[PDB]
């Protein structure tokens, strides 16, 4: 639902968001957290279909080796 009318609902709201991002990034959620997401499917939907995004665990991009001075 709406943002949050209490510290408590602010927490849940943020926790759901973080758990959704954590998973989008490739990390697994704990059993406790999976249960949490079910308990607030209401909150999960609100910022799921309307407030999506992508992710990335870690990285190690590609470098282009150079080879100069020959002839």
């Amino acid at each position: 639902g709406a943002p949050a009318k209490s510290p408590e609902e602010m927490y849940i709201q943020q926790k759901v968001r973080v758990l959704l991002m954590l998973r989008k990034m490739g990390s697994n959620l704990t059993a406790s957290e999976e249960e949490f997401l079910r308990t607030y499917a209401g909150v999960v939907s609100s910022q799921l279909s309307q407030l999506p995004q992508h992710s990335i665990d870690q990285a190690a991009e590609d470098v282009v080796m150079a080879f100069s001075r020959s002839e």
Binding site: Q14, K15, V18, L19, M21, L22, M25, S27, N28, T30, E33, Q53, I56, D57, Q58, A59, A60, E61, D62, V63, V64, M65, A66, F67, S68, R69, S70, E71
Partner: protein
């Protein structure tokens, strides 16, 4: 034998008819070792032949005078003599001759001069020889082109000026046309050598690439002429870092993968280096090299290479590119294992390996760890304790190589992925690393914070571990990162804080 001086006189006559009859005779004497020395010793004579050849309007005399010079250029005295009497500007003008004869003699004499006569190179450039030679590359007489291209290589070697001129005349497109059109070994060789010299010039490099140079040279990598193959490979390596946006590379890539199995260590070294550059940020090439069994070729090439970092470093960097960011990425990661490459990869993290190779080896372990089936094998290969040793030493070096900050990021990053497996987490924790990871959260470097928080986040998925992390004073440094602009740092930092509850 004082006939030389009478001919010199005749050659300078007014009646072209005799000027001709004289050119025939000089040319004939030009063939005898005795008659020829007399000619190359009278600067009056040689100077007559030149002016004549250059100003005459009778083809027979243009060919005869030209041939005579071609004969004298055979000896030391002959060359100095032609040079001293302004032969070069002359011969250069003759490159414009419409006769396939006067032309062959002119380019051949010039070749002799460029090869031996001191002061020859500058004179030819001076007379605009480079421009005429390049315009001459549209001929189809392979022997002629072989001579011509070789003059260009002589004139371009270590001379930026000449190169740019060759570039302004469309030398790269003509040279590339040759590599795609002819099969005469000597020509392909002399031409590949002109491209090699031109490929070290940052402005020529892009032009050769756009003319289809990568593909053109890729055509001769399996040729029996070993000197032809080597020259194309060298040129290919010099151009590779500027050809990572080209299409129609299927053939070259496949051939390159096959060249990895060669017994010629310089072939393998070059092929590896070229593949490394071409798979760097080009998923198209990554998928292709994978479809043609590149992972196996690369793993086999590393096993055989041993401690030869000239081969393993490019190979490992190529394997790293092929194990991330492309549809076949997950398959390659898995393929590296199936072909017995994990043990060799992990080994490379240890001495005698140097930092560049260790840095590249870390990035690959990191990619290989993305595939859960590599989690245990990498562990059983002793990867974890070694990655922690590199990290710990790079970090202490930093708090007091090739940038130890990078080793710190790569090792922590590799451990972050490896921590996805329960047994790996137990090992990472038994190595007493949590205090270090918590310390890493205070790094000024954003990329270090992300991987530090990430590994702490993976470890925290276990209750006992999450409690030790909290007990290690992680809460303060983590909270200070909750407002990071880096979604990664912010997310992981929040995750640990939530898990410690």
């Amino acid at each position: 034998t004082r006939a030389i001086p009478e001919l010199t006189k005749l050659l300078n006559d007014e009646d072209q008819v005799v000027v001709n009859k004289a050119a025939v005779m000089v040319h004939q004497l030009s063939k005898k070792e005795a008659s020829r020395h007399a000619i190359m010793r009278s600067p009056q004579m040689v100077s007559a032949i030149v002016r004549t050849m250059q100003n005459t309007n009778d083809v027979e005399t243009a060919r005869c005078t030209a041939g005579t010079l071609h004969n004298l250029s055979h000896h030391r005295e002959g060359l100095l003599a032609i040079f001293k009497s302004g032969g070069i500007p002359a011969l250069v003008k003759m490159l414009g001759s419409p006769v396939d004869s006067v032309l062959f003699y002119a380019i051949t004499t010039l070749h002799n001069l460029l090869l031996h006569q001191e002061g020859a190179k500058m004179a030819v450039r001076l007379a605009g020889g480079l421009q005429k030679m390049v315009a001459l590359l549209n001929k189809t007489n392979v022997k002629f082109l072989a001579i011509t291209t070789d003059c260009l290589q002589i004139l371009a070697y270590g001379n930026q000026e000449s190169k740019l001129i060759i570039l302004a005349s469309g030398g790269p497109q003509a040279l590339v046309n040759i590599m795609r059109t002819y099969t005469y070994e000597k020509l392909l060789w002399t031409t590949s050598r002109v491209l090699k010299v031109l490929s070290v010039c940052s402005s020529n490099k892009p032009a050769i690439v756009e003319a289809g140079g990568m593909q053109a040279l890729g055509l001769h990598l399996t040729d029996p002429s070993q000197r032809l193959v080597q020259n194309c490979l060298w040129t290919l390596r010099n151009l590779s870092d500027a050809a990572t946006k080209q299409e129609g590379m299927e053939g070259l890539l496949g051939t390159l993968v096959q060249l990895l199995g060669s017994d010629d260590i310089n072939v393998v070294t070059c092929a590896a280096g070229i593949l490394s550059n071409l798979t760097c940020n080009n998923y198209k090439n990554k998928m292709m090299v994978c479809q043609v069994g590149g992972i196996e070729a690369l793993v086999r090439t590393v096993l055989r290479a041993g401690d030869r970092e000239d081969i393993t470093e490019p190979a490992i960097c190529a394997l790293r590119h092929l194990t991330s960011r492309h549809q076949e990425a997950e398959m390659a990661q898995n393929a590296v294992r199936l072909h017995y490459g994990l043990p060799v990869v992990v080994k490379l993290l240890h001495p005698p390996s140097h930092w560049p190779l260790i840095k590249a080896t870390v990035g690959l372990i990191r990619n290989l760890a993305l595939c859960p089936a590599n989690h245990a094998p990498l562990r059983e290969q002793g990867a974890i304790p070694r990655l922690v040793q590199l990290l710990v030493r790079a970090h202490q070096d930093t708090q007091r190589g090739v940038r130890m900050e990078e080793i710190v990021e790569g090792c922590t990053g590799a451990l972050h992925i490896l921590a996805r497996d329960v047994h790996n987490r137990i090992v990472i924790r038994g190595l007493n690393t949590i205090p270090l990871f918590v310390q890493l959260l205070y790094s000024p470097i954003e990329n270090i914070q992300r991987v530090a928080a990430g590994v702490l986040c993976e470890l925290a998925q276990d209750k006992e571990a999450a409690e030790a992390i909290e007990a290690e004073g992680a809460t303060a440094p983590l909270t200070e990162l909750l407002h990071s602009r880096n979604e990664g740092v912010a997310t992981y930092a929040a995750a640990v804080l939530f898990r410690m509850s």
